[PDB]
Structure 1
Amino acid sequence: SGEISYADFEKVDIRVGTIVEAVPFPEARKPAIKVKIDFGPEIGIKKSSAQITVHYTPESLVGRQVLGVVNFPPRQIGPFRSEVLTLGFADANGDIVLAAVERPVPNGEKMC
């Protein structure tokens, strides 16, 4: 990807939030989990989903802080209307590892 300005980075609104609900998404083509993430009092609770069943479980995900893009338009993923892209990386086997914060931070803080 070509070089960018700070403005073109800053306009992408990435926030940290805490997963408050997680359930399997068996309707999806690939194995996946649906979550609700609390992004703090201003942004509120937002829906997302991800192919994160290899390393994570609905039971263990609740309470984890994740990073998400919060300013996309909603995305219909089969029957599920997602509001946020939950961010991660492929590991050495291609399985998804979640982005995180090194220690707890207020929900709704912007990445910078």
Structure 2
Amino acid sequence: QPTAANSGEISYADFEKVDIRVGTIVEAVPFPEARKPAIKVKIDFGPEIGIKKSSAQITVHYTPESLVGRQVLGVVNFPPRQIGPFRSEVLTLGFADANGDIVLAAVERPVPNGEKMC
């Protein structure tokens, strides 16, 4: 007969406090020191937040040339993360596909840079 652990549920506050924004990639280059292939990006999160640095394991489905102009979703309120010689400011969000390759989170149509996910 079944037994169970505690609820994994959260309050709205514990969701809201995670600041996820949409922004547009303005620069993309290879990330030479990455353990697994990656691309370093600069993302324009709009006039208030500004342009922020990030990286992602996204060389399978994407290229530096095709990424410029793509809107991505990122967590903007982590402390900076030192990734080898690169100091990342934002965590860029994605999903593993059927093969384990990274597919970016997106918006169904473009929206203003800097909008919060809700």
Q: Structure 2: any 5+ residue segments left out of the alignment? A: 1-6
Q: Once the two structures are superposed, what CA deviation does each residue of 1:56-105 show, in whole Å capped at 9, x if it has no partner?
A: 00000000000000000000000000000000000000000000000010
Unmatched 5+ stretches in structure 1: none
CA distance in 2, matches of 1:29, 1:7: 35
TM, length-normalised to structure 2: 0.94
1:77 aligns with 2:116: no
Q: 1:61 and 1:16 mapped to 2: Cα distance? A: 14
State the 1:26 CA deviation: 1.5
- Tell me, in whole angstroms, the C-alpha distance in 1 between the residues paired with 2:71 and 2:113: 8
Q: Does 1:6 align with 2:12?
A: yes
Alignment: residue pair count: 112
1:61 aligns with 2:67: yes
- SS of the counterpart of 2:14? helix
State TM-score, norm by structure 1: 0.99
Q: Give the root-mean-square deviation of aligned CA atoms.
A: 0.8
Task: Work out the CA distance in 2 between the residues paired with 1:108 and 1:62.
Answer: 17
Aligned to 1:105: 111
What is the deviation of 1:51?
0.5
Q: Percent of counterpart pairs with the same letter?
A: 100
